[PDB]
Ligand binder design. Structure first.
Ligand SMILES: CC(=O)N[C@H]1[C@H](O[C@H]2[C@@H](O)[C@@H](CO)O[C@@H](OCc3ccc4ccccc4c3)[C@@H]2O)O[C@H](CO)[C@@H](O)[C@@H]1O
Ligand SMILES: NCCCCCCOP(=O)(O)OP(=O)(O)OC[C@H]1O[C@@H](n2ccc(=O)[nH]c2=O)[C@H](O)[C@@H]1O
Ligand SMILES: [Mn+2]
Length: 273
């Protein structure tokens, strides 16, 4: 009987103040966000959202950033009137990090929970400064974190597609998902950009003011060193995407934790083959 939510949420307040210098207590954040259900799920109670969104976070040893992420995003996602769920894909073990393979795991595993039709892929340390920056999907792949403080509030280059993005289920399937062999830092987001272009799509973005985003300043994590093969890998995306991605993926889930504000999937994604 519920009518459809309006096209744009009337609850949005625009520009918000973001700070990362205070402690965060997730028990309290949960109290502040009473309508968020076990596992970090929420749907509005007064209308039906056409946006069934799984928010995927690549993760390992960033609990503090995550706390900030949950404190700021949860209120924003409810104001955006989304039918959403949060998934932190925690990489088991201590070997070289693989951001994009975790993202692929996230897509596959969240689909087992619910009929999601949109996927937001977000680094754990990026917080939006304006709730008008929609964390849902569009008719074309959506780049969300378009104006980051660390890049001077502008794109570092015009084809930059890293940070936070949103792909509908169909867009993600059309590019065979993300590459599984970008181990260590860099390039996997450029590869993904290439995949979208090679499948006839173009990047949708909000304007630079609405797209303003804060990056929690942090130092280098061990086990995610710049991948030296990244420039050669992005040069062959058209050929490699055909057989590297969803259709060449395996992983072993070790544990699934339903916390009040998010579901954490700990997974073994292995090492280079
Ligand atoms: C592959 C890679 O390392 N990508 C990461 C990206 O790296 C940037 C950065 O190094 C920058 C400053 O030196 O230069 C970029 O390259 C310039 C450029 C971009 C795209 C082109 C496409 C066709 C022809 C010529 C081009 C020139 C380089 O890609 O930095 C991002 C932000 O830190 C990372 O997310 C990304 O993984
Ligand atoms: N001068 C300090 C510069 C330090 C450069 C470190 C690289 O910085 P960025 O380009 O922001 O990449 P990154 O923050 O390491 O993370 C990319 C994303 O991977 C995730 N990530 C990466 C590495 C790691 O050990 N754990 C983790 O969770 C996380 O969601 C993160 O936001
Ligand atoms: Mn970062």
């Amino acid at each position: 009987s519920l009518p459809a939510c309006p096209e744009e949420s009337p609850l949005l307040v625009g520009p918000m103040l973001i700070e990362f210098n205070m402690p965060v207590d997730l028990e309290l954040v949960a109290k502040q966000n009473p309508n968020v259900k076990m596992g970090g799920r929420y749907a509005p109670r007064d209308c039906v959202s056409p946006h069934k969104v799984a928010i995927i976070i690549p993760f390992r040893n960033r609990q503090e950033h995550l706390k900030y992420w949950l404190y700021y995003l949860h209120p924003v996602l409810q104001r955006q009137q989304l039918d959403y769920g949060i998934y932190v894909i925690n990489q088991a073990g201590d070997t070289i990090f693989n951001r994009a393979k975790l993202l692929n795991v996230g897509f596959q595993e969240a689909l087992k929970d619910y009929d999601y039709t949109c996927f937001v892929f977000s680094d754990v340390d990026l917080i939006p400064m304006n709730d008008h920056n929609a964390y849902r999907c569009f008719s074309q792949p959506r780049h969300i974190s378009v104006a980051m403080d660390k890049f001077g509030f502008s794109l570092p280059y015009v084809q930059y597609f890293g940070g936070v993005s949103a792909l509908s289920k169909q867009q993600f399937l059309t590019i065979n998902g993300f590459p599984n062999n970008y181990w260590g830092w860099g390039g996997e987001d450029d590869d993904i950009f290439n995949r979208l272009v090679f499948r006839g799509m173009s990047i949708s973005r909000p304007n630079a003011v609405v797209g303003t985003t804060r990056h929690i300043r942090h130092s280098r994590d061990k086990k995610n060193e710049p991948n030296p093969q990244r420039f050669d890998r992005i040069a062959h995306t058209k050929e490699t995407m055909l057989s590297d991605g969803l259709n060449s993926l395996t992983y072993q889930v070790l544990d699934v934790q339903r916390y009040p504000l998010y579901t954490q999937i700990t997974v073994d994604i292995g090492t280079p083959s």
